[model samples]
Target chain A: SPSYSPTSPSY
Target chain B: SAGALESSLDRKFQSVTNTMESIQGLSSWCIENKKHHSTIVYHWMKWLRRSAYPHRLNLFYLANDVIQNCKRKNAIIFRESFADVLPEAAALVKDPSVSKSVERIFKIWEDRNVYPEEMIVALREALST
Candidate 1:
C-alpha cells in the first residue's frame, strides 16, 4: 500500500 | 454477543495519515472487527465524502490497504463492502488524474483476483456512465 501526497495539505 | 463498543474507526479516521504504516495500522484494526465490516464501510464512506480533495485518494488507499490485507485472512465482507462502494468513492474524485489512479487500483484488484473479473468490469462500467 502506498499513499500519494504530492505535498502535504493543511488539515 | 457483541459488546457495545464505540468504534475507534471513527475517531482515528478524522485525521487519517497518508502513510503505509498508518494505513496498515488502521487496516489491522478493521480486520480485528471484520464482524462489523458493513458498518465500518458506512463510516469510512461518510468520512471520505466529507474529506477535502487532497485526502480523498488517501482514503481510497486506506480502503485498498484494508481490502488486500483482509482478503489474505479470508475476511470477505471487506471485499464485498468495498466492491459496493468503490464506484461511489471513485465518483467523488473531481480530478481526472486522481480518478485515473483509482482505475489503476481496479486493475491491480483484477490481476490479484480480489474480485471476479465480471464484477470488476461492472464496477468500471458503473464508474464510467
Candidate 2:
C-alpha cells in the first residue's frame, strides 16, 4: 500500500 | 507532528485491483511485470513523502518495514523509489567527489544485505550533507 497522507509531512 | 488520519492507510496499500501479496512476491511481481517503474510505485512514493510522521514513521521507515517483514529483494526498492530521481540527483552530486563516494558507499551497503528504507534514507541524508 502506498502511504501518501495529507496530514503527514512532505518529503 | 503531522496529524495522519485513520484513513491514512487507504493509499498505503497497493491498488485493490493489484491485489495483495507477500512483500517478496510483490517486489518480484513489480519487476517481472515491468511495473517497477510505473506510476503505481510513483504514487506509493508520493504518498510516502507526503505522509512523513513524527517518531520516524516516514516513507523510508514504512517502506523498510515492508521490506524487512516481507523479506523482499531490496534492489528494486531503490530503483523503484529513486529511479525517477537518482540519475539526475547523482549527476548533480557527481561534481563533488566526496558526495559521489558516499553515494557509491551507500549502494554498497545495499549490496551487502537487505537494508531498511530508513537506513538508505539516512545514508543519503548524511551523504548529501
Candidate 3:
C-alpha cells in the first residue's frame, strides 16, 4: 500500500 | 524490505543486493534511456528537491511522538529518530536502481536468449516483430 501520511508523517 | 527486501544490507541477510554486479556496472542507466541530455539532469534535480520534503514529513512524525509523550525521553528519541530517518530520506534522494535495471533488461530484447512473448504465450497479443 502507498502510505502517504501528511501530519502523521506516514510516507 | 521483508522477504523481497532480503539481501538488503539493512536486513543483514549476509550480503547486499547485487553488490558484485554494482561494482562492475556502476554507470547510471538513466543516461542510456534518456536521449535528451537536459531532461535527465532536470529529472535528477526534481528528485533532489523532494529529498528535503521527505525529511520534513519524517520530522513531523517524530514531533507528534514527542507531543503525545508516547515514550521515554522524547528529547533523546527525537534526535535518535532523526538520525535514522535521515538515512532513509537520503535513499529517496537518489533514483531507484530498479529504474536502471529495467533499462538494461529491456535493451536485451534482441539478444539471442531473448524470447518474444508472443512465441512463448499460449494466448497473447500479436508480436511486435
Candidate 4:
C-alpha cells in the first residue's frame, strides 16, 4: 500500500 | 503555476515507493534542493495529508529518509522544516495499524536524539488516538 505509479505516489 | 507535477518535488512524489533506494533518492534530491528547502518540506507535508491509510508509514518512511539522511550530512534546514510540519502530520494519522510502526519510528528518533524530548512527546500524544 505504499506509493505507486509508472510515475506517481499511488496512495 | 503550482499545479500537480509542477515541481521536481511533485515528480519525486510521483515516483514514491517503499524501497529504501527510491526513498533515499528522493531524500537526496530534497537535500540537494536546499534553495527550495521550505517548499520541499511543504510538498512532503501535503503528501502526508493526502496519504491513504496503508501508505501512511511509507510516507513517514520518506520523512524518516529525509530527516535522518539530511541530519547525517549535517544539514539542518530540512530537519527544521520537517519539525515544523510533523506535529500536524501526526494529527493527520487516522489508521490504527500505523500506530505501532509510528511508535517504533518515534522511539528511534528519541533514542538517537533526533528530536527533542518535547517534540517526541508531542508526536506520541498527537498520534495516540
The interface RMSD values of the models, given in order, are 11.4, 11.5, 18.6, 10.8
lDDT tens string, model 1, B1-129? 243364467767666866766766777677787877777777777787788765767777777767766665444568887777766767777466566666666666776677888777665764455
Name the top TM-score candidate: 4
Please write out the lDDT profile of model 3 over residues B1-129, one tens digit for every residue: 343522221122111123323211212232232233322223222233333443323322222222222223333232233233333333332334322322232233223223344432311111111
Query: Candidate 2: which pairs clash?
Result: A1-B12, A1-B13, A1-B14, A2-B12, A4-B47
The lDDT values for all models are 0.67, 0.38, 0.27, 0.66
When 1 and 4 are scored with TM-score, the better candidate is 4
What is the DockQ for all candidates, taken in turn? 0.12, 0.04, 0.02, 0.07
Candidate 3: C-alpha lDDT: 0.27
Misplaced by over 4 Å in model 4 are A1-11, B1-6
**RMSD vs true structure, all candidates:** 5.9, 12.7, 21.9, 6.1
Worst 10 residues of 1 chain B by lDDT: B1-10
Docking class of 2: incorrect
Instruction: Give RMSD (Å) of candidate 2 vs. truth.
Output: 12.7
Choose 1 or 2, whichever is better by TM-score.
1
The candidate, 2 or 4, that scores higher on lDDT is 4
lDDT of 4 by residue, B5-118 (tens): 347786577567566667766766776777766777677767766667556667777776666656653656576777887777777674667766666666667776777888
Candidate 2 chain B: 10-residue stretch with minimal lDDT: B52-61
